[PDB]
Write a protein that binds this ligand. Structure first.
Ligand SMILES: O=C1N=C(c2ccccc2)CC=C1O
Ligand SMILES: O=C1N=C(c2ccccc2)CC=C1O
Ligand SMILES: O=C1N=C(c2ccccc2)CC=C1O
Ligand SMILES: [Mn+2]
Ligand SMILES: [Mn+2]
Ligand SMILES: [Mn+2]
Length: 200
């Protein structure tokens, strides 16, 4: 079929909030979304996975973690996850320092992606077009925080997480994997996938 543009794909398949946050992030690190378009799609994808990872997860009135998929969560509920990725560096570290001073959890060297109030730990989210073990080792070598939990997703449904601790229920992670599958399929229908996979 005809080759589409990755730009068109990203604008059409991702929520504008996500697209906007991704553009601001790329701009901040001096990369242009209109040139680094595969990177642009990868950044939107990673952001979306971070949001989906926290979606619907709350801490209840008793302090137990629960899932609430209705539009209206009970007002006494607390979000289970703090989202760190997608915030400018100043606000991101402000949130990190807050969490650290509040919970007692040690401060990370690099900005992680999430904080889990149930498991009491920061999380680094990875999304890869390559083999998950390879990508896992690269991120572990980068951060080496060793308190920061790592959770890798691939576009073909594989996962790898620190100590074989996957944090979320199968259903939550299946939502994420299904989304990645749809992204891959749609890219392929626009003949964007081969270039996107190999560009990582
Ligand atoms: O949102 C981010 N984007 C990054 C980026 C952007 C363009 C090229 C390489 C890394 C790095 C770290 C982030 O938190
Ligand atoms: O995720 C980031 N978002 C940034 C951002 C977000 C909104 C407005 C300006 C910069 C800056 C750096 C990041 O790593
Ligand atoms: O895991 C991350 N990967 C990023 C990324 C992904 C693809 C291309 C450029 C940056 C940005 C921020 C992260 O936490
Ligand atoms: Mn960022
Ligand atoms: Mn991040
Ligand atoms: Mn990440």
């Amino acid at each position: 079929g005809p080759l589409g543009s990755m730009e068109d794909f990203v604008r059409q398949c991702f929520n504008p909030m996500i697209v906007e946050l991704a553009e601001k992030a790329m701009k901040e690190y001096g990369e242009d979304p209109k040139i680094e378009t595969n990177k642009f799609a990868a950044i939107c994808t990673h952001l979306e996975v971070c949001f989906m990872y926290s979606d619907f997860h709350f801490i209840d009135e008793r302090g137990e973690s629960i899932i609430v998929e209705s539009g209206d969560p009970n007002a006494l509920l607390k979000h289970r996850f703090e989202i760190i990725e997608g915030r400018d560096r100043i606000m991101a570290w402000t949130v990190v320092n807050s969490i650290c001073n509040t919970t007692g959890v040690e401060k990370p060297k690099f900005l992680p992606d999430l904080y889990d109030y149930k498991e009491n730990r920061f999380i680094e989210i990875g999304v890869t077009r390559r083999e998950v073990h390879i990508y896992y080792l690269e991120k572990a070598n980068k951060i080496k925080s060793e308190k920061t939990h790592i959770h890798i997703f691939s576009f073909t449904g594989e996962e790898m997480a620190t100590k074989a601790d996957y944090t979320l229920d199968e259903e939550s992670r299946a939502r994420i994997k299904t989304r990645l599958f749809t992204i891959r399929q749609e890219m392929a229908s626009r003949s964007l996938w081969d270039s996107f996979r190999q560009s990582e």
